[model samples]
Target chain A: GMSLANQIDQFLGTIMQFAENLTSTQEAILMLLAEQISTNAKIAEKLKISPAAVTKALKKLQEQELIKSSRATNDERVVLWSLTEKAVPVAKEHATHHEKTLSTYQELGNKFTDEEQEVISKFLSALTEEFQ
Target chain B: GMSLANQIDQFLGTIMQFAENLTSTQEAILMLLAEQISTNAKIAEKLKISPAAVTKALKKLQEQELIKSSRATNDERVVLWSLTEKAVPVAKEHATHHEKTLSTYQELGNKFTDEEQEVISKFLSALTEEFQ
Candidate 1:
């Protein structure tokens, strides 16, 4: 029988493996653009990354043609970003992965009675606090 | 109410924050030495990291006086690694953190009856597969 510690480690390991597949900043930028076009400053604020870090990642994404930049119609000083067609599939795939993972959690929730689910939810909340 | 996805994200974020506090390789090395003295090749195999990576991390640990290497009495070519006095507290703290996290899981398990615990275990197993 696997100990809870071992089980948790395996789960965390897989999560880390998925994260290793993409640089978190690049992945976040792509996912953000997948939602809507935005400015560099907005992206920085949304992701809580420094403006310089966002600019650097944006430059890399542009070079890869994953994202493109355009000046705002009203203000040339402000640059807006949107994904290229090449980036669409990548971002969509990432979104799909997240959806599937969330659905699994939903499925688990459905298995329990309301009382049981409340207990499970409490467990998750306490477990989350343990990490902190 | 926080959605399950948001809760999971917060939990993972905290785990990543903890990881960022120490390079995983260095932390693993410290934790492994906390268990027992071992050799470079042994540590590499246990951690599934390249021998060169282990060697490099070991060197850094040595520079910090966190670990010391000695030649085996019977074979000068064989090197043994053990934690230094300076490293004991660090390793102990890491071990204590893991113990506390595991205890939280155990406590949650105890809250459920055997049948309910089985359901939770199954859920965890299924969720682990989703990540893969």
Candidate 2:
């Protein structure tokens, strides 16, 4: 049997693998726009990437017709980005992917007693702080 | 207070953020070489990236003097890659980063009783399978 540390490493490795699979800036932009129409600056902030990188991805997304942009009603200088009609299903699938992940965690937590669940929750909370 | 699902999502998001911070392919190649001296093809296979991509990163590392390459004695066509003395500390720092992460998990695990630790272990084991 694997040691506890090894098991945890494997779990973390799987998560890293999933993150690595998200190599496409365009797809990430699509997912972000799915939540709400936002400007390029806000998208860059949310993604923790550069404004130039966000603009590059936005240009590609526009080329693919996966996203559309419009000036804000109040501010002509501000551009708001949102998914195109064609991109709705694509973005929806991405949203569903997150929902499925959350549901899986919820289901696993259900298998444990409330006290045990609290322990797990505390562990997770500490683990997040560890990353900082 | 955040719901359990939100807590879990935040934890997962933190992990993803760390993974995304690994944006340098050259650093990844340096870390891989720190483990063992290997050829381009082997490194490509281990990293799950294309051979061309590995070659590109390797070239940059070599130019930066972080890695050195040589032809195999048995097969002159085969190129073996290894890290330079300068890269040892960098690679070791990366290794230490991983060790610190695991140690944090261990320390947190110690906070719970043995039975509670077992529950956390089981949850981690199940969570890993969920990624599949």
Candidate 3:
């Protein structure tokens, strides 16, 4: 590896820059609900947080106008959550920050030799797959 | 360089692991309040969010029992804020996440040469100086 671009420095710098853009587990759930339309119980399972935490986080997000939940018409027992239009940009900004971070990481990794690059590529693929 | 471990992949996986561990501009305020007490205007200046957004975000955090604000004793104009103990861990967890993240990144960069290491060290020092 030629060690170009000070990858570690660039990586940490990027993380700190976009640090504000990263969301909480609760915020992520609301973003997920922006698409999933789930009940608190459902979201709690997906987020692995307590239902109480989900309820609390929901209260917070709702007050911010990020989320709006209502009792389902078909089933009053279930509450469905969705994102407010204002939250759209907030979520998208988070995506933008992460995309930039990934791009920087990839470019910094560009200094490696073909053989080293192949090694890194294999590891990254496996790690990303495991991340899923 | 030994390249014995999947440093890059390991570092990334750790980031994604605590990816959900970060706090937002709003949450950070509450966490900050758990230590330093402040007003909305002051917190907004510190966080760089608009005052209106602070009001809204404050409402959210307050409703979660993470913070409480009341009018000042001598002056009703300034509203003072402090955090509920529950928010204590939430903030400390963010610190923990970053600490772990730093450790992983350090370990990953350890795979490089002494020359590569020294070069990166200089670059990291300069970048961190700028980040401040």
Candidate with top lDDT is: 2
**Pairs with steric clashes in candidate 1:** none
lDDT of 2 at B92: 98
Q: What lDDT score is found at residue A84 in candidate 2?
A: 93
lDDT of 1 by residue, B30-118 (tens): 99999988999999999999999999999999999999999988899999999999999999999898787677667766767777666
Task: Show pairs that collide, candidate 2.
Answer: none
Give the range where candidate 3 chain B is weakest over 10 consecutive residues by summed lDDT: B1-10
Ranking by TM-score: 1, 2, 3
Q: Best candidate, DockQ-wise?
A: 2
By lDDT, highest first, what's the ranking?
2, 1, 3
lDDT of 1 by residue, A1-132 (tens): 886556766666666666565577989999999999999889999999998999889888998999998899999898899999999999999999878767767776676777766665666666667656
Give one digit per residue, the lDDT tens place, for model 3 in B28-102. Answer: 785668568899888889888899888888888888887877788999888899877788887678657656656
**Window of ten residues with lowest summed lDDT in model 1 chain B:** B3-12
Give each prediction's root-mean-square deviation over alpha carbons: 7.0, 8.9, 15.6
Candidate 1, residue B74: the lDDT equals 88
Deviation in Å, model 2, residue B68 alpha carbon:
17
Model 3 lDDT per residue over A34-92, tens place:
56788888898888889888888888888888888889999878889888889888877
